Design a protein around this ligand. Sequence first.
Ligand SMILES: O=C(NCCCC[C@H](NC(=O)c1cccc(O)c1O)C(=O)O)c1cccc(O)c1O
Ligand SMILES: [Fe+3]
Length: 288
Amino acid sequence: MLPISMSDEGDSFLVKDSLGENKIPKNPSKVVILDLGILDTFDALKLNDKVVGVPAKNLPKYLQQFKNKPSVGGVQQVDFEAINALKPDLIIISGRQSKFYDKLKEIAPTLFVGLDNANFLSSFENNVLSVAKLYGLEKEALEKISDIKNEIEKAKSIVDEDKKALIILTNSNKISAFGPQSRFGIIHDVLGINAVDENIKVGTHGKSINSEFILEKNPDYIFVVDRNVILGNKERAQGILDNALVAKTKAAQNKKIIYLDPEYWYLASGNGLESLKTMILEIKNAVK
Ligand SMILES: O=C(NCCCC[C@H](NC(=O)c1cccc(O)c1O)C(=O)O)c1cccc(O)c1O
Ligand SMILES: [Fe+3]
């Protein structure tokens, strides 16, 4: 994935990313943000007053300080009319809104801050730094990035080299599996937790598996992202995994089936200076 590149043009930057090119003014004061992790970053960089629109339909519990910003809909149900009515000077999007890119760029310059699943930390840093550059806050952003590296090192320090993990997403009653370099890859790729299968095929919403597969892998840890919650259905991962196949795995026997908070993992707030920290601690605390 091409990183964000930025050239200083006096009162604006000429900015290039994976989706195209924009002239972005310095210090934009009317920013519509559709990536929840970058919204968390605005908070951490003390830029809350710059924000004028947020996806209130998908606003997590840890981002309720933005509850009174004007809504621009949800991460998937982008309210174009609301965005146009706000007359923003910058729109910030990630992978869920690439399909809306031309429509959004005609309203205002549109910055892409997608996380590269093959290069998580590199893309995270480039996203946070590129926002911080717009406001002259590179120093503060560097010191926060450095804190996150220290959390990563504390986390990696307690990881048991000989235990193995399987990441699953549950949707309806269906299970799908994710591996290294996936949208949840940071468990394997950044935090160094080994995988039951390093060779799982990457593909947005996953690799279809069943409880037999889980038992055959016999993971020490099962990390579960229950997409039922973000979609709103009845069926819990805890119910689907209450079977005697899964019951025999080392993870079930050691109570190391971990239900990760989907508002972080699924909504993918890994761009957040505080929300990424939270995610690292959540893994550390489950495996220490
Ligand atoms: O382009 C994406 N999805 C388009 C198809 C989704 C259609 C539809 N999705 C949702 O209802 C949905 C709602 C909120 C957040 C989501 O990630 C959703 O997939 C479904 O239920 O299958 C996408 C991109 C990056 C990451 C994702 O999770 C995506 O869903
Ligand atoms: Fe999705």
